[PDB]
Every structure is written in C-alpha cells, then in structure tokens.
Symmetry: C7
Subunit: 258 residues, 7 copies
C-alpha cells in the first residue's frame, strides 16, 4: 500500500506533484490489477543516507539515462516529462503500465541502472539500438526516490524486464545529474561535469577513459549544444534497446558492434 | 458479443483506446445491423503465442500495408489513424462500415494479409492500382489483435471482400512493424529493417530478392525520407487496388504489368 | 413518401448523411409544396443491379458532369458539395427548389444525363454556354441513387427541364467517376481513365475519338492539374447552358458552334 | 397590405429572403408611417409574362443600373446588397425610407427605369453626376419583382422621386442581367452580352451604336475586369445623379455635357 | 423639453439615431443640470424651408467646418463622428457638455457659423490656431437641424461661446456639404464644388477670390487627396482657435497674420 | 470629508472620471488610514479665479512636469495616466499612497510646484537625477484642481515630501499646458509655446533666457518630435530626483552640476 | 504567528501584495509543517531605522544578488519575481519550501547576505558556480523586510542553509538597489551607482577596488546593457553556488579560482 513519505517523487521536476504524494499513488495504483502488482509498487530504497539526509551516491544507486538532448538543455532544465500539465483524471498521463509497454506520453521519466560485474567493475548497461548513430548522451544520475519497476510487477505482468528501469513520476531536477558522456558514432568525445550536482565533493569520482576532454558545464557553454538535425524518450523505450553484452566498459566505445 | 480481453486493440497507437475496450466494441457494434454481422465482429485469433505471451510471427499472421510515407516517419511513429482525438459519440470516427465502404476519416488503420500458394511460397498480395508509379512502401507487420473483416460480415453486406483486410482500431505502434520494401516505379530498390521490432531474433528471416540494398533503420536515417512531391489511406481503400494475379513474388517487381 | 432505404444518397461524399436518410428526406420534403411535387421526390430506379449488388453500368444510367476542376482534384476527392458542414435546420443548405432555381450553395451536387438517339448512339448532352472557352472537363459517372428532378416535379412547376438533372445530396465519391474528357477551346485533347472506378472490368468500354491521348490517372499525375487561371457549380446551373443540338457526338468537338 | 406571393423578391441574390416574404414585408412595412405610404408598398406588375411564366422582356420593364464594378464581377455574382447577413431585427438593414433618403447600408439594391419618348425611342435615363469620369458600366436588367418606389409613397413623403427607382430587397441574380455598356470618359467602348441571361433568344435585341466592340462574356474574360483604381451604391443614390435631358440616346456618349 | 420631430438630427451620418430622437434627447438632457440649460437644448430654427421641405440655403444658415481631411474622404463619407457604435448608456458618447469642454470622443460633430458684417459681406470666421500651417480645408455646409449651442446654455455654463457652434449629433451626410476651400500655408489654392450637394441649382453661388482653380469633385479625384503627413476634431475644439478679427474675407488668405 | 464640487478633477484627461467625483473620492479615501490623513485629502485652492471662472495663472499656482515625451505628443494629447481603463474596484489603479511610494501604475499624474525665492524670483525646482542626460522636457502647467499631497498627509505618513507634488487623478488635458523647455544635456535649446493654452493672452508672459529659439507649436511640428532612443513617470517618482539647490534659475542650464 | 505590520513585504515589486500581508502570511504558512518551522517564519529585524522610518544601511543589513541582467534592466525595473500574476490559491506560486529546494517559479526573489570577518572587513560571499564565466552582476541592496530563511527553519528542515538567504515575496523595487559590480570573466570591469537609491547621501560609501570605472546610471545608459548571448534565478539557487572561501574581498576578482 501507500508510501509513508514522498521520497519516491522527491526528484520531481513537476514540483507540484511532490505535495500530492498519496493522491498520486492512488491515481497510479488503481489502474494496476492486483495480479500484475500483488504487493503494490515497490519504491527504491536507500536512495537517501539516513545519517546525512543526503543522496546516497554509490554504484548500487547509480542511474543512467540515454538522451539525444545536450547539456545546455539537460543540465539547465533536468529531465522534464513529456506531459507537464496538471490532470487528476485517470487519463493516460499517469497510466504506468501503458507508459512502459507502449511509450505513450506521460508524467514519467525513465532511467536504467548502471551495471557492474562481481568485482564491482562497470559492464555494458542497457543501450539503445541507435546508440552508435550520430550524437547521443549517457547521463549519470543520483536522485532520491523512483519506482523500482522490476520489483513492482510479477514477471509475467512486467512488460519489459530487461531494461532494469527506475521510473520517476514528475521527472528529475538537474541538481541530481552529475555528469554525461557525449558520444559521436558510438565513441566518447567528451565528458561533461555538472558543477551544480547536489554533492559537489564527489565530482572527482566521475570516471571515463583517459585523456578524454573533460568539461565543467555552465549555462550556454559553447560546446554544450551538439544535437542531431520529437519523442525525447524514443531511446529509452524497452524494445528500442537491449543489454548488448557483459563486457567491461573500459574502452572509448559504448560496447556495441559497428 | 463482446471480446473477453482487449487483445483486439492491443497494437493501438491511440493508447487511450486500450482501456475502453468494451465501450469501443459497443460504440462500433451498434452501427452494425444484425443482418450485416449475424455473429458480431470476429477478432483475429492466435495473434499472440499463448506459451510465451509473445507476438505470433508466422506466414499465417503476416500482415502488409502499402503506404507512401517513408521509414523516418513510419518506423518512428507507427501507423496513426486519420482521426486521433477522443470522441465517444456515434460520429463517423468509429463507423466501421462507412470507413470500409467509403474511406471516410476514422480511428481505423487497415492492413491486408500476405498471400501464399499451396507450397507456402509468397504470391502477389492485394496491390494498389498506383503501385508502379513513383515511390511506395510495402510495410511488413506482426501485431496483436485486429478485426478480421471478411469473417465479421456476410459477403452480401461486406463492402469489399477481395482486399482481405485486418483492421486496427487505434492504429499500430512501430514496434509491430518489422520491415518495409521501398519501391521506385514498381521496382524494389531497398529493404529496410526495423531493429526495434518487438522480436529482434526474427530480423534475419526478412526476405527479399538477392543483392538488394538492405538497411537497418535509425531515426533520421539519411536515406529514410524518400517520398513523392493528403490522404495517407488512399492506397489502402479497396476500389483503389486489387489482387493482380497469383504469380510468385520472387522477382524485383511488385508483379503488376507496366 | 419516404424512401425505403438510403440508396438515393449512397454515393455521398458527406458520408454522415447516409445514416440520416429519413431525417434528410423530411428536411428536404417539407420545403416542397404538395402542388410542386404531388407524388413526392422521385429517386432514380435501378441504379444498382440487384443481381450483382453493384452499380448498374449502362447508357440509361450514364451521368455526366461539366466541371472546371481537373482530375488531380476530382479523381482524388470526388464531387464534394459547396456546403460541407452539418446543419439539421431548414436553412438553405437543403433547400432543393432554391438550389435548382438560383444555384445557391447547398449540399447538392448536380449531374446531367448522357443523351442517345434511337439507334442508341450518343448525341450532344446539355452543355454549358462557356464550354468552348478555355479548359473544361466532362466527367462520366455511374453512381447509386440520385433524385430524378424531372420526375419529381410537375412539368409546369419544374424550374428548368432541359437540363435533365440527377441531383446528389451529399455529392459523389471518386470511385463512381469512371473517366473524363479534357477539352481545350471546345476540343478534346485527352481522355482520363480513373483506375479506381468501382467496376474496373468496364474501363475498356470508355469511348472517345480515335487517336486521342488516353491516360490512366494516379494521384498528382503530371498532366492532371490543368485548370483556368469560385463557384464550382457555375457551369452546371440550368440558365448557364442548354442542349445545343441533337447531332452525333462522334467528332473531336463538344458540338457547339465557334 | 401583404403581397399574395413572393414575386416581388424572386430576383433575390440573398435567396434565404425568398421564403420569408410575409415576414419581410411586415419588417419593412412597420417602419413606414401610414401617411408616407397610405396604400402600402406597390410591387411592380407584369414582371412575368402570363402566357410563358418567364420574365416579361419589353421596354416597359427594362431596368438599368449604373455601377463601377465590371462584368467579371457582376455577370458572375449579380448585384449582391451591401448587407448580406440575416437579421430579423428592425435594424437599418430593412429600413427602406432611410436607405432611399440617406444611402445607408441595407439589403436593398436599386435600379432605375429605362426612358423612352412617345415614339418609343430611348432617351437619356437618370445618370450619375460622375458618369463622364473614368470607367462606369450601365447594366441592363429584366427581373421578376421589385418595389415601385414612386407608386409606394405619397409625393411629399417620397424622398427622391426624380430617380424613378425600382428597389430589389435581396438584390438581383446574374441571370436577370442581359448586358452592359462599358463607358470610358462618358464614351461607349464596348457592349457586353451575358450569354446566361434567363431568355437567350432575346440576346440579339441588345442595342447600341454601330461598329462598337460587342463581346459575349464568360468567367474571367480577359477584358472584363476594367475598373477605376468602397460604396458600390454611390452612383445610384438620388442626390448623386439626375436626368440630364430628354435627348435621344442614339450617339456614342451617355448624353452628359463635358 | 423634447423636440416635436427629428429635424435636429436629420443630417445624421449615424442614420440609426434618426429614429430614436426622443430617446436621444432624453439621454443627452439628463446629463445637463437645469441651471446650465434652464430652457433645455435649443435646436436651430428654419434650417428647412417649411414650403418646399428643402434645406434653407441663406447666409444665416451657412455653416463652416475646418478639417484636415480632403474632399476624396469628406465628399464621399461626410462628417462621421469619432464614436460610431450604438450605446444607449449614459457613457461619454452622448455627454454634450464634456464634449464641448474637453473634446472627448462622442457622437457629435461641430460646425461654426459663417460670419457677416452689417452690409451682409463675409468677415473672418472662428479659425483654428494652426490654420496657416500646412494643408487645411474649410467646408461649407447647409444641413437640416443641429443644436444651437450658444442658445442652449446660460452664458456662465456655456464652456466656450466665442466659437458659435452648431453641433450635429450623428454627424453630417455628404449631400449637405456644398463646397470646400483648400488652403496651403493659409492661402487658398483651390475651390472644390460637391456636384451631389442636395440643391445643385445653387452651385454657382459658391464664392471665392477670382481666378482660383475651381474643381467639380468626383470619387477619387486626382487632386482630392492632399493631406498632411489622429483626432479629426482637433481643429474644431474651442481653445484650439478663435475669431482673429472682423476683416472682410475678400482676399486669398484666411485672415490670420503670418 | 468629500469635496463639494469636482474642481479637484476638472483637468482630467480621463473625462469619464469628472462625473464620478464623490465615488472617486470614496474609492481613494478608504485605502487611506485616518492616522495618515487625519483631516482627509486636501485639494488645492484658488486654482480657478472666482471672479472670472477662469484658471488662476500666478506663480503661486504654476506647476511643472519633467517628461521625456515631446510636444508633438504632449501638446496634442496632454498628460494621460498610465492606467486609462475604468475600474471601480479597490485595485491599485486608485491606490494613492502606493502610487506615491512605489510609482505603481495608476490613474494619477504628478506635477511639482514651481519654486521662488523671497523676492519672487524663480529658483531650482525639484529636478530628476537624469535631467542632464540626453533630451528632457519641463512642461509648464496651470490647471484647475489637483490634490495637494504635502497638505493631505501627516508628515510621518507622507511618503516623500520633498517633491511638493500636486497629483491629478485622471491626468491633465493639453489646454492646461502653456509651454515647455526642451533641454539637451541639461541645456535649454528651445522654448515651445502651446497656442491652444486655455488663456492665450498670457502667452507673452512665458519666460526663459534671452535669445533662445522660441517656437509656437502646431500638430506634427517638424522639430516637435525629439526624444531619446516605457515608464513615462520614471522621472517624476520622488526617489528619482531632488531639489538640487536654491540657486536662481536665470541661466541656460537646469542648475544641476555636470 | 502573523506579522504585526507589512514591513516584511514593503520592498515588493508586486505592490498589490503589500495590502494583503496577513492573507499572504497565511497562504505561505499553511504549506509549512510545524516541525519544519516550529516558531513560524522569522522576518528580518531592524531593516528600518526606528527613529527616522528610513532604510537601515549598515553591513549587517547589506544584501547581495548575483544576476545576469544588466543595470538598464535592473535599475529601471528592480527585481520582479518569475511569477507576477495574482493567484490566491495554494498553487506553487507561494510555496516557499518548494521554491528554496527546487527553484520552481514563484513570487519570491532571493538575496544573500554580504559577509564580513571579525574586523568587519568584507570576505567572499556565497558565489554562483558560473561566476567566472562571461558577464555577471553582483547587485548591492538595502531594503525593508525580507524573510530570514535560516532563522525560519529547523536545521534539518531548511533545504539549503549554505546560501544564507533573505527572501522577498513580491521582489524588490529599484530604489532599494544601491549599486552593482559588473564582472567579465570573474574580473570587475565597472562599478555602477544607482542615483535613485532611497538614501542618496550614502552613495559615496560604495566600495570597490581603486581605479575601476565608476558610473552613475541613467535609463538606457550606453554601457548598461551588457549581457550574455531563461531562468533569471539560475545563479541564485543554492546547489548552483557556494561560499568558496573566507578570503578578503579586496582584489579585482570575485575570489573564485580560475
């Protein structure tokens, strides 16, 4: 049943949702048959340090988002959902299962979990099929909350499990986005650091290959606008990607064969 | 009478229709005289594998759609109907018989069945009269649901039986479109594969003549925008085409005499 | 009184009218004094061959329409009336007698009967006064229904008899238009065939002089847009034309003296 | 009192007025004091030939209208009034006396009678003061109905008896306009014949000086658009013209001194 | 109290006011304190010849209006007030005293009386302060009605008596404007005659210096559009002019020192 | 309490306010705490000579207004307030204290008193801080009414006393503006006289340095449009200026140090 | 509980808020849980001198605001909030905690306190992360009121104490902005003085490095428009900056390492 607090939606870009936690949980829960979610939605845990009141920043809570939009947009605005207007009706806006299964416009923003091997080394995450084409960004996020999709649905009622998603009703504000990799043709050409990330003391922990241009972003950065040529979530819809392999993410590529 | 589940409209592009299955079935059924449809609408069966929950991909369920719109549009948006707004009134939007007989704007999107001879080899499908003119695409679809038109009406009240149509209220999402043939003057010049097709392990089963350019699509593909110079369904209206012959579809042409 | 079925309006371009047959018949009938139409409106008989359930295609049901609009418009859209919006009020939209007498905008599309001599050979039809000027088209139609004007009103209360009109409330869809003659200065320069005509097996029966360019139309045909330089019905209003003579229509002209 | 039939408004361009004859007559009659029109409005008589039911075409019913608009406008649209919208209120739209006295916008269109001497030869009609300036047209009309102004009002209650006006509530359709003289600087330069005039057998009766260009009009005629450089009735308002003399109209001028 | 007939507003350009005489008189009268107008508004007398019904054309009834707008505007449209819409509310539209005192927008149009010496010779009228600057017109009017301002108010409640104003609720139609003097830099350069003036037999009585270009106007006259480079009444507001002297108006100037 | 007559608002540009004197006084008075205005608003006295009814024109009643708008605007339109629409609500429009303290948009127009020494010679008035920059005008006004701000408020409730402001609800009409000094960089370059000033016999009393261009204004005067490059009251808000000194205003400057 | 007077919002740019003090305080207070603000909002004290009623101008009350907008905007308009329309609903407009935590649009304007060491010498204030990039302004403010954020919330319920914010509901008018430093690449290039600052006698107290261009502003100053290339509060959101160090602010830089 209902969440005790609004932690699950604390990263929200649509800030007005944050004070309507219970109402939102009901609105979403009622379009989910008990057989699909026997125990109800499962919110991620320990997204916040109990000792600090601060975002938990560890491999286990490290989220990723593939997006064609550049840092001058994302580091300024965060991830705003496709639907931004208030509508307390059972319309498609809050229809979670339809959103995941069909990618219909909604108030939800997806992310996928960073993947590690047993030695705790990073391996290929769920990657979009079009990742090797043109310019794409892989944003690194540490945010409070999110719905743990795979833990919320019975295997046979969970539309696409392979994507290992953590969904954010209302989106994610920019202060929860630590960095991003800028890829051109599947190759890393730059690493962007968001100086306004909620925990600036961890900025030096941002990893990447050696000798790759690393830039500290600021509004209207001269090189922060690269983009192709619209559905901002096309590259985050389950059937539009997959986990290509379990190779170590220790090269200059995104580990997808050309 | 009424369908047990919403399988018939599960491919829907107008996703809001999927949760209003019974209401939609009533809305459509009431403008159909009992003498036209003695037993009611007949929904296609076995469109989904009961053992996997997955789309049934076999010759028997292989659908085709002739369209002048290119892959950069279709593989991105799917087949969205001419009418996209909600209207629970008995207007023409849901008037199935008028749509079939006159091609009036509606929420329906049509497909025609792939045709095979007794040896299970492909033969000429229902083809538009204008197929040999300019640029046209023949999309290959495997989707859940659809209304089996020929099985839903007495032949005496079925506007156009030859087309053997399977109609999709709400359209078809792009993940159900596996590939497309690009024809220029009735000749195949390229075969496009949709990497995001719901069952990617079958992509290698896509057939075509030998040595024809085969391309894996991605958004804004450089050659994915070819189009002539609007009624997107003009080339799918029954009187606007026919089954030209039963010849084997084993050449570079669409089997229509120049 | 009332028609048994909606055959009279089955060719309708304004398809929403087809399901409101009785209401439409009342709407029209009430603005017609009993002395003008003692026996009520007389619908054309045998427009559909009951043995085939399809359009009757014979000289006796062959209709013509003079229009300045070219095939790229007409073969695509059919004949849509000057008034296209729904209005169940006794406004001028449905005022049949006013439309005939004055040519006021309405939901009616006019046609005139093809004319034959006693040997069954074609003779000059009712022709517009401006027919020898510039570019004009003479469309050939075989459609279900239509109101037989001369049989609906008494001789002495029938505004203009010479025209032998067949009026179509809601217009005529393109599949009922078999061909058209393109005239330039009163001379035939091309014969256009509509491949999507409802009975394609009769396309070879389309007549015309010998050695005249004969073209099978398709959307946006390169030569299908010729037009002068608007009232689309100007050339179909009774006082705007006449039957010039009873000569055989066996030459390259429209039988009007230059 | 009330007219027996709607003959008085049968020439109407605003066709919707034709079925509201009695209501219109009341609407107009109530703003006319009994002392101004002791016997009520007097409608012209014999505007229709009682042996044929067609418009009476004789000198006695020959009407004229001075207008700056050319044949490409007038022969296509007729004379449409300055006010064209429906308004069953006692507004100025139907205020006949104000219209005649002030030329305020209304649903009325004025014409003036052709003038003849006792030998039945044509003499100078009421002519606009600006007639010798630039380009002006004198249209010839034979229409059913019209209000006989001079016979409708007591001499001292008739604003401008001199114009011998016949007013048409709702205007005059083009089929009632037989021809027009095109004047440039008060000189006839062309005679236009309307081939669509309601009685085409009388077209040869159109008179004019000898050896003047005579043209049979058609839509968009190349020379049918001459016009100066708006109140379309400026040149038909009583104080804006007069009967200049009673000379024979047998020259190339409009009989007004330069 | 109330006027017996509507003579006072018979010159009205806003013709709809003419039938609401009593209502208008009340509307205006109620915003006028009894001490300002002890005897009520005084309408000009003998503006209309009781014997002909014709406009009285004599020095005593000769009115003038200074205006920057040229004959192509004024002789075509007359003097239309700054406020032209119907409003039966006690708004400023009909507020006579505010209009005279402040020049606020209203339905009124001002004129000033022509001035004569004891020998009946014309002397300088009330003239605008800006009269010697650029292009200005002095229109000559003979109209029925008008409110005699100086006779309507008690001297100490009459804002500006020196102007000798005759005010026209609803304005003045062009047929009441006989002529105009066109001044450039305070010098007469042309005399315009309105051929459509209500009494054309008096046109030859129009006076002016000798050998000054005299033109008979017609719509769009080539020289009838001269104007500077908006408040059309700026030059008719009392504080904006004065009676400069009592000199004879027998020269080429407007009798104002340069 | 309430003013006996509307003298206080007689200069009004928003003329509709003049007849709603008592209502306006209430509307303004109710948002003024009794401790701020113990005795209520104090209206200026002797603004109108009781003997003549005329505007009192003496040093004592001489008002000034600093404005960036030129004579072609001001001498034509007067000083119209920032808010011009009717609103009988306690909105900010009539909020006198907030207007004085914050300069929020309202129906009020400020002026400041001309300043004199004990010999009755003019000394520096309250001057805007930006007066020495670019082009600014100092208008001279003699108007009826106005609220005497310093006499209306208890010193510790009066926002800014130093300005010796005279506020005009509804603004000031142009006939109350006698002249203006045009300054460029704090230097007088021209003196403009308004010939339409309510008392033209005093025009020669307009003072200024010797040998400075003196111009009599008229609409669209060629040099009457000089302006910089909007809040028209920026230079009349108390904190935006001050009384710089008490020096004699007998030079070509505005007595502010460069 | 409630504030005794409206001092807290007296600097308001949205002046209509000033008269709705209690209502505003309730509106804001009700969305603040008692555990977050045990004692309610704490308004700054001694922002106004008790003896004179004038603004308290001392180090203690010296506020700063980092803004990308230049003096031609700010010194003219002040700091107007992102939300400017009236809305007495519990919408996000007045949601103080959401504002502070997320930077959502609201009626609030942030400022940060000037920082001093023990000797009372200025040290580095909270500075935006992007301060060394391009052009940024640091405005100096002395205003009445403001909410003392750090004193209003219990440590663990104060989103971002590090900013040491004083928040102004309704913004700050320009007369409370004394000066601004213009930085280019983190270096001071000009010091702007607002001559209209509420206490002009303190203008000489404005400090800065020696020999830096010092300019007295006026509307449209030629160099007062420098700006980069929009969220006007981006550089005032807590996570978007920090207190870089406690070094003396006695150099030309903003004390942030390049």
């Amino acid at each position: 049943n209902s969440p005790k607090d609004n932690t699950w939606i604390q990263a929200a870009s649509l800030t007005w949702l944050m004070d309507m936690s219970s109402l939102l949980y009901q609105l979403i829960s009622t379009r989910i048959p008990s057989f699909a979610s026997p125990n109800g939605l499962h919110m991620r845990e320990q997204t916040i340090d109990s000792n600090t009141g601060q975002i938990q920043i560890d491999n286990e809570h490290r989220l990723l988002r593939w997006d064609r939009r550049p840092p001058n947009d994302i580091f300024l605005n965060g991830f705003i959902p496709r639907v931004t207007n208030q509508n307390l009706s059972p319309v498609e806006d809050t229809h979670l299962l339809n959103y995941l299964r069909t990618n219909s416009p909604s108030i939800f923003v997806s992310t996928t979990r960073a993947r590690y091997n047993n030695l705790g080394l990073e391996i290929t995450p769920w990657t979009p099929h079009s990742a090797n084409n043109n310019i794409i960004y892989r944003y690194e996020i540490f945010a409070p909350g999110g719905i743990d999709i795979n833990a919320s649905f019975s295997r046979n009622h969970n539309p696409f499990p392979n994507e290992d998603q953590i969904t954010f009703p209302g989106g994610i504000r920019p202060e929860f986005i630590r960095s991003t990799y800028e890829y051109h043709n599947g190759e890393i050409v730059r690493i962007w650091i968001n100086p306004n990330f909620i925990n600036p003391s961890t900025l030096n922990d941002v990893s990447g290959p050696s000798n790759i241009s690393k830039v500290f972003w600021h509004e209207n950065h001269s090189e922060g606008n690269n983009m192709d040529s619209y559905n901002q979530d096309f590259d985050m819809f389950a059937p539009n990607g997959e986990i290509p392999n379990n190779n170590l993410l220790n090269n200059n590529s995104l580990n997808v064969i050309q």
